[PDB]
Amino acid sequence: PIVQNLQGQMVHQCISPRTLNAWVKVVEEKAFSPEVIPMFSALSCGATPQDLNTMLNTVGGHQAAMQMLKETINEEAAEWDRLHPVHAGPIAPGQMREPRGSDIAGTTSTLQEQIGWMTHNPPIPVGEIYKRWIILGLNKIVRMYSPTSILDIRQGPKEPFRDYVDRFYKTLRAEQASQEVKNAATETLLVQNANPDCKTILKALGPGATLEEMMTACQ
Amino acid sequence: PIVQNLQGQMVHQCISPRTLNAWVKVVEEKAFSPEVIPMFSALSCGATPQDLNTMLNTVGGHQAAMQMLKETINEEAAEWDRLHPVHAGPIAPGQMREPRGSDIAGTTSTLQEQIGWMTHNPPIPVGEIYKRWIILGLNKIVRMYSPTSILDIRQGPKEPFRDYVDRFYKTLRAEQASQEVKNAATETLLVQNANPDCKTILKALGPGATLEEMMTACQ
Amino acid sequence: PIVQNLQGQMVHQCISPRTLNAWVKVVEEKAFSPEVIPMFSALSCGATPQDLNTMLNTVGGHQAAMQMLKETINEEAAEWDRLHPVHAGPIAPGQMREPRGSDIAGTTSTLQEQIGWMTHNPPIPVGEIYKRWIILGLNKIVRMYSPTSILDIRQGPKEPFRDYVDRFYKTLRAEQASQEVKNAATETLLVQNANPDCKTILKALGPGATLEEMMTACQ
Amino acid sequence: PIVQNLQGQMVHQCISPRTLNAWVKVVEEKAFSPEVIPMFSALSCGATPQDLNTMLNTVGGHQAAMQMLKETINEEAAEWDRLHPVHAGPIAPGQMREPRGSDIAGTTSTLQEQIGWMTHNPPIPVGEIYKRWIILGLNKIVRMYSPTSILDIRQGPKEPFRDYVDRFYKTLRAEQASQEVKNAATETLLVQNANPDCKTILKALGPGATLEEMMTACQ
Amino acid sequence: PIVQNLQGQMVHQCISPRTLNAWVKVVEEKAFSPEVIPMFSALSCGATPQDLNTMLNTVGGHQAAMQMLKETINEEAAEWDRLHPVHAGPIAPGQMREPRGSDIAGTTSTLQEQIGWMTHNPPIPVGEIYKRWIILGLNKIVRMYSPTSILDIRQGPKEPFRDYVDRFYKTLRAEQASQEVKNAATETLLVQNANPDCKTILKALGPGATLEEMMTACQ
Amino acid sequence: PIVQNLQGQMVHQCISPRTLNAWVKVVEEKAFSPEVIPMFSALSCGATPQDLNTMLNTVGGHQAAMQMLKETINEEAAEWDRLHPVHAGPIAPGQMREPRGSDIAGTTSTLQEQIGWMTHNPPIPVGEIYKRWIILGLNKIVRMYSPTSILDIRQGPKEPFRDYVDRFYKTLRAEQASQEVKNAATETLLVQNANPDCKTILKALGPGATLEEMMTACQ
Ligand SMILES: O=C1Cc2ccccc2[C@H](c2ccccc2)N1
Ligand SMILES: O=C1Cc2ccccc2[C@H](c2ccccc2)N1
Ligand SMILES: O=C1Cc2ccccc2[C@H](c2ccccc2)N1
Ligand SMILES: O=C1Cc2ccccc2[C@H](c2ccccc2)N1
Ligand SMILES: O=C1Cc2ccccc2[C@H](c2ccccc2)N1
Ligand SMILES: O=C1Cc2ccccc2[C@H](c2ccccc2)N1
């Protein structure tokens, strides 16, 4: 990653064994549960494109997903190249060349180039641009591997309302509902999918009940 | 987080793998037992709003709770915006803009903005303001998930008085009794809910017995 | 905690995940065995009052003990306030206010105030003053939870003398005997409570035998 | 390794216990699965030739592989020596000598020499040159230990299409297919090797289907 | 401990959680096996008397041993006081007082005093003086808890000579034989205590056989 | 160890708990398998003679080996003393004395002396000299504890050729064959000791087959 040291210059630091192992283990334990994504982003704080490739390449399973991710990265790289074409022909001696999509993705750029871009004044933030593409891909994977429609999350007859609400919003998160819908689903599908006893209680609460109030009501 | 380095300037540092894993594990092991809250506060020492969102987003279960927390944060954000409206229209070139509620919550502000606010002279402590909102929400969650009324904590006939007192104050903590009440419950409900043998001994101690003295008396 | 950095100024540093977890685990594994106290003191090296409260608040069980500790802290705070009353009315602009008992305990003082006191020249050592109160309380707890009188530690007929001596001094430590008594118990109760065979051997050694010599004699 | 310190000079630092153990454990757990290679590269960030030899020598099993790797390194060393012969006869007093293949491999050069080369202006990057040779060898090992031809990866009749795709691309990775082929295999062998039901669905999608679209279609 | 920082002044640093836990665990796992002593010395590198007391006080079992150790420390303290009596009466304002035995042992000296002594020019090395006393005591404990005489280590009839030699020198180490005797025991008791078959082979080797040669001969 | 700090002076640093535990555990788990030696060398990076003795002394088992190692160190010390006799009689005030063998081994030299030698300009590298003696001894131990002759490593009739090659070169490593022999054994003993089926295939390959080619041929 690129870090400020103790004396305020941005320099390269090797990726730590602790970081490498954290990432491999979270993928082993959680697969593509949605909360793996913010974990990736956090563990990749300050990453160069080289570091992001290290993290992705250290994954041993899930090669269908990793191939889908390669496809998404190629699409974003191709769109970058449409927006920001680069001068063909020889670079100015000693000067910084402009990054192409594959340079951002770390496949045709050196670590030194990456460092140069990222520590330029002002920085050409190749690590952050690539990380956005990766996360775009990972979010597709999450949605793909979500095993259950929100329509099929219904409260069982002796299921505690809290355990049902947990299943409901765990499902909405993987299915990738916007916050609008998450905020909104509470006046609607959450009540619809509730068991008959709790449904009666919730119907009687009136509109504009908070989730807290719904949860208390069906406790 | 924002830390002073070895040479006394406040700078950003990535959230550590050790911190990320500590938080995920304490939620996995303890859920919303009350002592998770001071753990959160401690693990979030110096956090930016981005870091606080990382911590909350890395939680995989408990999505009912996390949706209730979103609701509490939205309420606090809305109250901030009432108290501190911001100038609409274009920002002064190169200057610091005033944070809105959603900026404090990290959803409409960049890391750079956050850093700017937090390291301003004097600091606009967006991390500490957001952390207060989060803890307000978490405390509601704790109270919600408290499974037992203090009225139902009674000493069993062969229950050691110490084990009963532990249950009693463990319950009062989750139910969120003030210190007044915790201090006070010792002249009252603690004795009432004691078994007949210990109740007789405690009644005879007189008023103004310390808990230590009550515990010794029923040993 | 407050630490000197690499360049010799005293500054605040966040409490580490390693420290937080060490403390929670030692309480989980050892409860209020006497050796938990020096562990607390060591893990709280350099602590602010905020940090000491973090450590105490992160404890999830033992709430009878934690309520007894609150009582002891309140008593010490009240005695501080007797000895060191503070000027009522407004503080001098920009100047340091004098700490009250509850300020020392971290309940009515900010982290900034604490830092100010602790790094004043000369330091008003609020962390060390509070830590003394806490340890006073913890020592009472240890004594309370000591399950066995020294009178009841007697060597079994086929109990190795070393295993008996271990039980004896493990008991004296929890019961909180002074070093005088620990030094002294060797000419007396240790021999009295020894089995008939070893008692004869020890009686014959004469007075002024070291523990080493007693242990060798009954090997 | 050679690291920049806190003040921006490149200096030698001992290999850490954490690094040493990470590498030994990944070889113990994963053998020569392809993802061990990017792990090696990452754990060897900044390594001297001495450090790379340490890592290879700390491996206890797999001695057939380690002997094959020695053979590959000897071949690369011999090709270096063809391209870059060195002046025989005595070195200039106090001056840097030119590295031979065995110097790059760390077998005839001292740590001091290595440091000298690597921190020269401009650096003679002996660590990076050796690491390339090692990785060339490791890639051969991976290919050797790949147990299954891509021709034999066929979707079972009740095998989820995702689990088949995972096996397929896990195999292609060990067999060391180029990205061209990985990108391409999706219009061809992946469909051919699919079970009859999914094969019909994929045939009907048309050419130019993404893997994402194929995966959705056979869900 | 007292450490040099990054800029070459000797300053105090808190004892680490890793150090505290290492020591507690080695005592839990190994008791007073001889190799615990060099572990203690190493884990106490740079320790103040306060730190050494922390380490000893964090031990929960073995209180017979810890009482024997207190006795040894008191004896060494008393001998220090004989050799180095201190001026009674008031200290020179602002000046360093001379340490008494109990000051060296950390029981009547503050951390500040200790730091003062240890960082004086030239240092009055109270940490190293106390550590020597402690190790003197620990060595007595080791010898006490050694369960087997060297006379009783004899090679069994189907015992591999190497396993017998391991038992032999493991015993000599706990029994605290000098290196002279360890060096010497090889021409004598080691052969005597060997089984009849190996004894014949060793007798025939001649005098002045190395242990290596004896071990090869009885392989 | 002696390390450069953040500002480029060589100073002493305590041996870490992580290093101490790494070494004890590798000896516990691997005994004197050959790969323990490069682990020792790596974990002892920068070590003083004191540190090397710490590492050796922290080993609890294997006392036959540790006594053999003492013998080897004494032999090397005696040869050093032959090559580099020291001036008897009093040292020049304030000046550096010349190290004797036992000084190099850390038994008659202080840490301060060691530091002085190792940080002299130019360094008298006592740590590296002692480490060479130790490794000489450890290599003898490895060879001693090698349980199997290379003559007895033969491919079983249904043993995969790769598993046989692993046994073969694992044996050659412990038996301490030179690289010449390891390189060479491939045209000879490896084929001889192969099972009849693979032997026929290898005989037919011709001379000058690489190990890779032999392994492929018998796959
Ligand atoms: O070097 C790498 C490793 C990797 C691993 C998994 C997923 C993507 C990647 C990306 C990459 C590769 C080729 C095309 C697109 C993206 N680059
Ligand atoms: O980015 C995040 C993640 C998160 C996770 C759990 C709970 C709250 C949050 C808050 C957030 C989101 C949307 C509305 C309110 C609060 N922001
Ligand atoms: O904030 C805290 C947490 C805590 C936890 C356990 C025990 C004592 C404390 C003390 C406290 C609280 C209220 C009265 C006295 C002492 N302060
Ligand atoms: O020192 C070493 C250790 C090692 C261990 C495993 C594999 C290769 C190596 C290389 C080495 C050795 C001899 C020839 C070629 C390469 N050097
Ligand atoms: O504070 C301590 C703790 C401790 C613990 C175990 C053994 C010795 C010690 C020494 C101590 C105490 C009293 C007399 C002598 C030595 N000091
Ligand atoms: O202090 C030590 C500890 C130790 C432990 C195991 C093996 C060798 C050593 C060497 C030592 C001792 C005495 C003679 C020779 C070598 N020195």
Short mmCIF file of N, CA and C in Angstrom, two decimals, chain E residues 101-172:
data_model
loop_
_atom_site.label_atom_id
_atom_site.label_comp_id
_atom_site.label_asym_id
_atom_site.label_seq_id
_atom_site.Cartn_x
_atom_site.Cartn_y
_atom_site.Cartn_z
N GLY E 101 18.37 -2.63 49.61
CA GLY E 101 17.90 -3.92 49.08
C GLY E 101 16.45 -3.92 48.67
N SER E 102 15.57 -3.39 49.52
CA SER E 102 14.17 -3.37 49.18
C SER E 102 13.82 -2.42 48.06
N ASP E 103 14.67 -1.42 47.82
CA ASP E 103 14.54 -0.55 46.67
C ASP E 103 14.87 -1.31 45.36
N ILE E 104 15.91 -2.10 45.38
CA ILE E 104 16.31 -2.94 44.27
C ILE E 104 15.22 -3.91 43.98
N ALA E 105 14.62 -4.46 45.03
CA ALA E 105 13.53 -5.44 44.81
C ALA E 105 12.18 -4.77 44.42
N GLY E 106 12.10 -3.46 44.35
CA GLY E 106 10.94 -2.76 43.92
C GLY E 106 9.85 -2.60 44.93
N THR E 107 10.10 -2.98 46.17
CA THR E 107 9.07 -2.92 47.17
C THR E 107 9.01 -1.62 47.93
N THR E 108 10.12 -0.90 47.99
CA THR E 108 10.14 0.43 48.64
C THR E 108 10.62 1.56 47.76
N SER E 109 10.74 1.29 46.46
CA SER E 109 11.11 2.32 45.47
C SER E 109 9.99 2.54 44.44
N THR E 110 9.85 3.77 43.95
CA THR E 110 8.90 4.09 42.90
C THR E 110 9.48 3.76 41.54
N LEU E 111 8.60 3.67 40.55
CA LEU E 111 9.01 3.55 39.21
C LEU E 111 9.94 4.67 38.79
N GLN E 112 9.58 5.90 39.16
CA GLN E 112 10.45 7.01 38.91
C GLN E 112 11.85 6.90 39.48
N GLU E 113 11.96 6.48 40.69
CA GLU E 113 13.29 6.20 41.25
C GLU E 113 14.04 5.19 40.50
N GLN E 114 13.35 4.07 40.17
CA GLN E 114 13.98 3.05 39.38
C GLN E 114 14.52 3.53 38.05
N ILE E 115 13.69 4.30 37.35
CA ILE E 115 14.07 4.87 36.07
C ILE E 115 15.30 5.76 36.26
N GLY E 116 15.24 6.57 37.29
CA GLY E 116 16.38 7.45 37.63
C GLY E 116 17.67 6.70 37.81
N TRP E 117 17.63 5.59 38.56
CA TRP E 117 18.82 4.82 38.77
C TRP E 117 19.33 4.17 37.48
N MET E 118 18.42 3.53 36.78
CA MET E 118 18.76 2.80 35.62
C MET E 118 19.27 3.68 34.44
N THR E 119 18.92 4.96 34.44
CA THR E 119 19.28 5.89 33.33
C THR E 119 20.27 6.95 33.77
N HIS E 120 20.70 6.86 35.02
CA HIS E 120 21.84 7.65 35.53
C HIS E 120 23.04 7.43 34.68
N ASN E 121 23.91 8.42 34.65
CA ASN E 121 25.23 8.21 34.05
C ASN E 121 26.36 8.20 35.10
N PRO E 122 26.98 7.04 35.40
CA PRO E 122 26.67 5.71 34.85
C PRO E 122 25.45 4.99 35.51
N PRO E 123 24.80 4.08 34.79
CA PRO E 123 23.56 3.48 35.35
C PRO E 123 23.85 2.70 36.65
N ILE E 124 22.93 2.75 37.62
CA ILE E 124 22.94 1.91 38.81
C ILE E 124 21.90 0.87 38.42
N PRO E 125 22.35 -0.29 37.97
CA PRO E 125 21.52 -1.20 37.22
C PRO E 125 20.58 -2.04 38.10
N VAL E 126 19.61 -1.39 38.73
CA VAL E 126 18.75 -2.05 39.77
C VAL E 126 17.98 -3.20 39.17
N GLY E 127 17.57 -3.07 37.90
CA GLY E 127 16.83 -4.14 37.22
C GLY E 127 17.71 -5.38 37.10
N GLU E 128 18.95 -5.19 36.72
CA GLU E 128 19.89 -6.34 36.48
C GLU E 128 20.31 -6.96 37.83
N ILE E 129 20.49 -6.12 38.82
CA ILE E 129 20.82 -6.65 40.17
C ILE E 129 19.68 -7.48 40.72
N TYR E 130 18.46 -6.94 40.63
CA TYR E 130 17.30 -7.75 41.08
C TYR E 130 17.09 -9.01 40.30
N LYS E 131 17.27 -8.94 38.98
CA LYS E 131 17.10 -10.12 38.12
C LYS E 131 18.08 -11.22 38.49
N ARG E 132 19.33 -10.86 38.83
CA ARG E 132 20.29 -11.86 39.34
C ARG E 132 19.77 -12.55 40.61
N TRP E 133 19.20 -11.83 41.58
CA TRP E 133 18.67 -12.41 42.81
C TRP E 133 17.53 -13.37 42.47
N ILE E 134 16.66 -12.92 41.58
CA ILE E 134 15.51 -13.73 41.20
C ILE E 134 15.93 -15.03 40.57
N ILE E 135 16.88 -14.96 39.65
CA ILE E 135 17.38 -16.15 39.00
C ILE E 135 18.10 -17.11 39.97
N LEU E 136 18.82 -16.55 40.91
CA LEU E 136 19.38 -17.35 42.04
C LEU E 136 18.28 -18.11 42.73
N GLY E 137 17.15 -17.43 43.01
CA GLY E 137 16.07 -18.15 43.61
C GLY E 137 15.42 -19.17 42.77
N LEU E 138 15.21 -18.83 41.48
CA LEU E 138 14.56 -19.74 40.56
C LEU E 138 15.41 -21.03 40.38
N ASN E 139 16.72 -20.85 40.36
CA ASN E 139 17.61 -22.02 40.21
C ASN E 139 17.47 -22.98 41.39
N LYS E 140 17.24 -22.47 42.56
CA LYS E 140 17.02 -23.31 43.75
C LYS E 140 15.78 -24.07 43.61
N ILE E 141 14.71 -23.40 43.11
CA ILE E 141 13.38 -23.99 42.85
C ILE E 141 13.52 -25.10 41.85
N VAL E 142 14.19 -24.81 40.73
CA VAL E 142 14.45 -25.88 39.72
C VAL E 142 15.05 -27.13 40.34
N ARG E 143 16.04 -26.92 41.16
CA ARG E 143 16.78 -28.05 41.82
C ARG E 143 15.83 -28.77 42.80
N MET E 144 14.98 -28.01 43.43
CA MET E 144 14.07 -28.59 44.36
C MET E 144 13.04 -29.49 43.70
N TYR E 145 12.57 -29.06 42.55
CA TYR E 145 11.49 -29.71 41.87
C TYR E 145 11.96 -30.79 40.88
N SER E 146 13.26 -30.88 40.72
CA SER E 146 13.88 -32.00 39.96
C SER E 146 13.44 -33.30 40.64
N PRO E 147 12.74 -34.12 39.93
CA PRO E 147 12.16 -35.31 40.61
C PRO E 147 13.09 -36.53 40.67
N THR E 148 14.19 -36.54 39.93
CA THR E 148 15.00 -37.82 39.76
C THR E 148 16.51 -37.61 39.91
N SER E 149 17.18 -38.48 40.70
CA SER E 149 18.65 -38.47 40.82
C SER E 149 19.23 -38.99 39.53
N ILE E 150 20.40 -38.48 39.16
CA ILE E 150 21.16 -39.01 38.05
C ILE E 150 21.52 -40.49 38.24
N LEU E 151 21.61 -40.92 39.49
CA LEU E 151 21.92 -42.33 39.77
C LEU E 151 20.86 -43.25 39.30
N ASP E 152 19.61 -42.72 39.14
CA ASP E 152 18.53 -43.56 38.77
C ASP E 152 18.17 -43.52 37.30
N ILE E 153 18.95 -42.78 36.49
CA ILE E 153 18.81 -42.81 35.08
C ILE E 153 19.68 -43.86 34.46
N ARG E 154 19.05 -44.99 34.13
CA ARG E 154 19.72 -46.15 33.53
C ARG E 154 19.02 -46.57 32.26
N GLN E 155 19.78 -46.99 31.26
CA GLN E 155 19.23 -47.34 29.98
C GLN E 155 18.45 -48.66 30.08
N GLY E 156 17.26 -48.62 29.62
CA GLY E 156 16.45 -49.85 29.60
C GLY E 156 16.98 -50.77 28.54
N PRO E 157 16.69 -52.06 28.71
CA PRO E 157 17.16 -53.07 27.73
C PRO E 157 16.75 -52.89 26.31
N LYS E 158 15.63 -52.26 25.98
CA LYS E 158 15.34 -52.01 24.58
C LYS E 158 15.20 -50.52 24.33
N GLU E 159 15.81 -49.70 25.19
CA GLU E 159 15.78 -48.28 25.07
C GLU E 159 16.86 -47.88 24.14
N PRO E 160 16.51 -47.15 23.11
CA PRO E 160 17.49 -46.55 22.19
C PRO E 160 18.48 -45.74 22.99
N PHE E 161 19.75 -45.84 22.66
CA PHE E 161 20.80 -45.10 23.42
C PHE E 161 20.53 -43.58 23.39
N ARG E 162 20.05 -43.06 22.29
CA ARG E 162 19.74 -41.62 22.22
C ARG E 162 18.68 -41.19 23.18
N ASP E 163 17.65 -42.02 23.39
CA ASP E 163 16.59 -41.66 24.32
C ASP E 163 17.06 -41.71 25.75
N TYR E 164 17.98 -42.64 26.03
CA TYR E 164 18.64 -42.70 27.35
C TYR E 164 19.55 -41.47 27.62
N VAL E 165 20.31 -41.09 26.61
CA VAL E 165 21.18 -39.94 26.75
C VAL E 165 20.36 -38.67 26.96
N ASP E 166 19.25 -38.54 26.27
CA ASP E 166 18.35 -37.42 26.48
C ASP E 166 17.87 -37.39 27.92
N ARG E 167 17.46 -38.54 28.47
CA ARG E 167 16.95 -38.57 29.88
C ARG E 167 18.10 -38.17 30.80
N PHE E 168 19.30 -38.71 30.52
CA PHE E 168 20.44 -38.47 31.36
C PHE E 168 20.79 -36.98 31.48
N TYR E 169 20.94 -36.30 30.33
CA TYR E 169 21.31 -34.94 30.38
C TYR E 169 20.17 -34.02 30.73
N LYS E 170 18.92 -34.44 30.54
CA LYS E 170 17.75 -33.68 31.02
C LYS E 170 17.76 -33.67 32.56
N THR E 171 18.08 -34.85 33.14
CA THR E 171 18.24 -34.99 34.61
C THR E 171 19.39 -34.18 35.15
N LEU E 172 20.57 -34.23 34.55
CA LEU E 172 21.73 -33.48 34.99
C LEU E 172 21.50 -32.00 34.93
#
